[PDB]
Scaffold this active site. Structure first.
Site, PDB file in Angstrom:
ATOM      1  N   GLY A  49       1.202   8.693   1.627  1.00 36.17           N
ATOM      2  CA  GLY A  49       2.114   9.738   2.060  1.00 36.17           C
ATOM      3  C   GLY A  49       2.357  10.820   1.023  1.00 36.17           C
ATOM      4  N   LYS A  55      -4.846   4.127  10.035  1.00 34.29           N
ATOM      5  CA  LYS A  55      -3.803   3.201   9.606  1.00 34.29           C
ATOM      6  C   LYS A  55      -3.509   2.067  10.587  1.00 34.29           C
ATOM      7  CE  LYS A  55      -0.614   5.331   7.448  1.00 34.29           C
ATOM      8  NZ  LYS A  55      -1.386   5.149   6.192  1.00 34.29           N
ATOM      9  N   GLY A  87      -4.219  11.112  -0.699  1.00 32.48           N
ATOM     10  CA  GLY A  87      -4.897  12.188   0.003  1.00 32.48           C
ATOM     11  C   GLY A  87      -4.266  13.538  -0.283  1.00 32.48           C
ATOM     12  N   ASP A 117      -6.076   2.773   3.358  1.00 39.72           N
ATOM     13  CA  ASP A 117      -5.609   1.776   4.315  1.00 39.72           C
ATOM     14  C   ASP A 117      -6.658   0.694   4.511  1.00 39.72           C
ATOM     15  OD1 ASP A 117      -3.212   3.110   4.778  1.00 39.72           O
ATOM     16  OD2 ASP A 117      -4.058   4.278   6.441  1.00 39.72           O
ATOM     17  N   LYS A 161       0.860  -1.175   0.000  1.00 37.43           N
ATOM     18  CA  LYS A 161       0.000   0.000   0.000  1.00 37.43           C
ATOM     19  C   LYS A 161       0.902   1.233   0.000  1.00 37.43           C
ATOM     20  CE  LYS A 161      -2.479   3.550   1.763  1.00 37.43           C
ATOM     21  NZ  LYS A 161      -2.179   4.703   2.671  1.00 37.43           N
TER      22      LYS A 161
HETATM   23  N1  LIG Z   1       1.682   8.666  16.437  1.00 38.29           N
HETATM   24  C1  LIG Z   1       1.829   8.967  15.120  1.00 38.29           C
HETATM   25  N2  LIG Z   1       2.932   8.350  14.535  1.00 38.29           N
HETATM   26  C2  LIG Z   1       3.199   8.576  13.185  1.00 38.29           C
HETATM   27  N3  LIG Z   1       2.532   9.334  12.310  1.00 38.29           N
HETATM   28  C3  LIG Z   1       1.436   9.926  12.960  1.00 38.29           C
HETATM   29  C4  LIG Z   1       1.064   9.776  14.298  1.00 38.29           C
HETATM   30  N4  LIG Z   1      -0.041  10.477  14.615  1.00 38.29           N
HETATM   31  C5  LIG Z   1      -0.319  11.030  13.497  1.00 38.29           C
HETATM   32  N5  LIG Z   1       0.510  10.765  12.422  1.00 38.29           N
HETATM   33  C6  LIG Z   1       0.275  11.325  11.091  1.00 38.29           C
HETATM   34  O1  LIG Z   1      -0.141  10.299  10.193  1.00 38.29           O
HETATM   35  C7  LIG Z   1       0.400  10.648   8.876  1.00 38.29           C
HETATM   36  C8  LIG Z   1       0.252   9.506   7.894  1.00 38.29           C
HETATM   37  O2  LIG Z   1      -1.141   9.286   7.588  1.00 38.29           O
HETATM   38  P1  LIG Z   1      -1.753   9.862   6.245  1.00 38.29           P
HETATM   39  O3  LIG Z   1      -1.448  11.308   6.206  1.00 38.29           O
HETATM   40  O4  LIG Z   1      -3.160   9.534   6.220  1.00 38.29           O
HETATM   41  O5  LIG Z   1      -0.903   9.381   5.047  1.00 38.29           O
HETATM   42  P2  LIG Z   1      -1.095   8.142   4.418  1.00 38.29           P
HETATM   43  O6  LIG Z   1      -2.245   7.402   4.891  1.00 38.29           O
HETATM   44  O7  LIG Z   1      -1.193   8.446   2.819  1.00 38.29           O
HETATM   45  O8  LIG Z   1       0.193   7.249   4.646  1.00 38.29           O
HETATM   46  C9  LIG Z   1       1.862  11.008   9.242  1.00 38.29           C
HETATM   47  O9  LIG Z   1       2.304  11.827   8.111  1.00 38.29           O
HETATM   48  C10 LIG Z   1       1.599  11.862  10.522  1.00 38.29           C
HETATM   49  O10 LIG Z   1       1.421  13.252  10.130  1.00 38.29           O
HETATM   50  C1  LIG Z   2     -12.517   8.356   2.885  1.00 38.70           C
HETATM   51  C2  LIG Z   2     -11.241   8.681   2.806  1.00 38.70           C
HETATM   52  O1  LIG Z   2     -10.645   9.140   3.817  1.00 38.70           O
HETATM   53  N1  LIG Z   2     -10.561   8.600   1.890  1.00 38.70           N
HETATM   54  C3  LIG Z   2      -9.102   8.877   1.470  1.00 38.70           C
HETATM   55  C4  LIG Z   2      -8.615   8.094   0.248  1.00 38.70           C
HETATM   56  C5  LIG Z   2      -7.088   8.391  -0.143  1.00 38.70           C
HETATM   57  C6  LIG Z   2      -6.211   7.860   0.989  1.00 38.70           C
HETATM   58  O2  LIG Z   2      -6.386   6.983   1.844  1.00 38.70           O
HETATM   59  O3  LIG Z   2      -5.160   8.551   0.910  1.00 38.70           O
HETATM   60  C7  LIG Z   2      -9.018  10.188   1.188  1.00 38.70           C
HETATM   61  O4  LIG Z   2      -8.121  11.024   1.555  1.00 38.70           O
HETATM   62  O5  LIG Z   2      -9.862  10.992   0.435  1.00 38.70           O
HETATM   63 MG   LIG Z   3      -4.148   8.092   5.135  1.00 40.15          MG
END
Ligand SMILES: Nc1ncnc2c1ncn2[C@@H]1O[C@H](COP(=O)(O)OP(=O)(O)O)[C@@H](O)[C@H]1O
Ligand SMILES: CC(=O)N[C@@H](CCC(=O)O)C(=O)O
Ligand SMILES: [Mg+2]
Ligand SMILES: Nc1ncnc2c1ncn2[C@@H]1O[C@H](COP(=O)(O)OP(=O)(O)O)[C@@H](O)[C@H]1O
Ligand SMILES: CC(=O)N[C@@H](CCC(=O)O)C(=O)O
Ligand SMILES: [Mg+2]
Lengths: 258, 258
Positions: free
Chosen positions: B11, B217, B45, B162, B8
């Protein structure tokens, strides 16, 4: 399996829920009553023109082809390979049709290279490999293909949907019908022209009767017709009552003769 | 064929050409040196957050999930199922990888229904049919799947990537690794936490250590781990030298224990 039939979908009708419901209703009826495998190739120039407005960007078409700068290929890919493609997949699902969305690069179905530096990321489409789509068809899926492609170097390309359809037709050895928002090619008085040949097409183009998107469309139709050795039609999918006969091979618009 | 490995990808690294080149370089090296079939599930995202800016729209996430109004599902589908998906397909092509882009509805790979009316077009993902993807894998293709899905009624749904990955993992009986822009789950001082259990996850969430996207996640990771009965890792794909060992199954981030 029989030679497929590629139905190319375009026009402003792509933005009509009533038109889409009526179309997919007729597609189901056709599928459940014909053994000939169907493949859909779609455009969506309208979805793009709208997104460029909400974005406040200009639209320039050099003789039917949209100039696609490097800074706009991602947005266009989103509108065509994403929004338009997945919208059609949703309608298929609504109608219990097992479909699979694809773009030109999947399985190298259609080969694409940069057509002209003056156009930017606009691709020139040519026959590719029919292996992936033939397998999908043999397994009972309805492939729904967008007109975005990719070069061997990894650059995304915007291919005019009519040209993509013709290239895929040659690849699959399939019949082709081009559906738009007009009842075929119209003459100077705006009346439907029943039959079309290469000579007649040239005349109308020179006279300025056939313009913009219809220039690209009639040329793609002629290429497919001479390449496949079979007639290619240009018709409208606006009126529900005509859909049945349309898919049955009846002259509803302009028939392009090889 | 062996049990697949779903990688997957998420980021801000999805917006880095250098990061993508380094990643696909390592993917090729892995593919040409391992018989285990790979499947990629991607998020994006960031691509969405940017498009909502150029559009001047707001972004609200109710506990990790993006509120997706009916008037924004088409734009989001374009960014995720279109732009993000086709960008990854272009990189695969650049690296001579025969890939095929798909979304959750293709072959009913992942079942999706509306999760909550308060979220709008956000989907709840659950195991579907592995037939289409298993066939693609057996034929030598690398499936690259977006997180957009569709309900049986034909409504497009935005699924958090995720959760889509976990659902597909159960569907395919595959192993799973979640790659992000951080070296796994970090603690209160921002240091990497090597191992994670359901009990520890609860604590950190309650304490406010794990927030936003990491809450979704870690929960998806735990679900996959208990469902598959195998450990699931959360790691970063930012540093080139770590990519090899990463794919080799070495602890580079946070290992989620069933
Ligand atoms: N305890 C934590 N440890 C690590 N990352 C965290 C934590 N709490 C929040 N995060 C946030 O979660 C982000 C990753 O999730 P997300 O932005 O949804 O990216 P993605 O799902 O595309 O990998 C990290 O960039 C960080 O900003
Ligand atoms: C519902 C929902 O949060 N979807 C995600 C899909 C993309 C991802 O996981 O990065 C979103 O940001 O729009
Ligand atoms: Mg995410
Ligand atoms: N002689 C002509 N006959 C018919 N349509 C024409 C003619 N000349 C130009 N057109 C234009 O071509 C349009 C169709 O092409 P296009 O807009 O590219 O849609 P699409 O390719 O999606 O079907 C018609 O809507 C009409 O405006
Ligand atoms: C290059 C090019 O003109 N592309 C077409 C593709 C969609 C279609 O045919 O409707 C376009 O409008 O952007
Ligand atoms: Mg056109």
């Amino acid at each position: 399996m029989m030679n497929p039939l590629i139905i190319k979908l375009g026009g402003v009708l792509l933005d009509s829920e009533e038109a889409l419901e009526r179309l997919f209703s007729a597609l189901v009826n056709y599928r459940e009553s014909h053994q000939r495998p169907l493949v859909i190739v779609h455009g969506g120039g309208c979805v793009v023109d709208e997104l460029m407005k909400g974005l406040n960007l200009p639209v320039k078409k050099k003789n039917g082809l949209r100039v696609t700068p490097a800074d706009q290929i991602d947005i266009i890919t989103g509108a065509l390979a994403g929004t338009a493609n997945k919208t059609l997949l949703a309608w298929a699902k609504k109608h219990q049709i097992a479909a699979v969305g694809l773009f030109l690069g999947d399985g190298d179905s259609v080969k694409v290279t940069q057509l002209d530096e003056e156009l930017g990321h606009v691709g020139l489409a040519q026959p590719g490999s029919p292996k992936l789509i033939n397998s999908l068809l043999e397994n009972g899926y309805l492939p729904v293909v967008s007109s975005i492609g990719v070069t061997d170097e990894g650059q995304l390309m915007n291919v005019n949907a009519d040209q993509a359809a013709t290239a895929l037709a040659a690849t699959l050895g399939a019949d082709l019908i081009l559906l738009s928002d007009v009842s075929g090619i119209l003459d100077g008085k705006g009346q439907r022209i029943a039959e079309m040949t290469a000579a007649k097409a040239e005349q109308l183009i020179e006279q300025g009767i056939i313009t913009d998107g219809m220039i690209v469309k009639v040329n793609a139709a002629l290429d497919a017709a001479r390449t496949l050795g079979r007639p290619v039609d240009i018709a409208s999918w606006r009126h529900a009552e005509q859909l049945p006969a349309l898919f049955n091979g009846m002259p509803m618009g302009t028939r392009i003769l090889a």
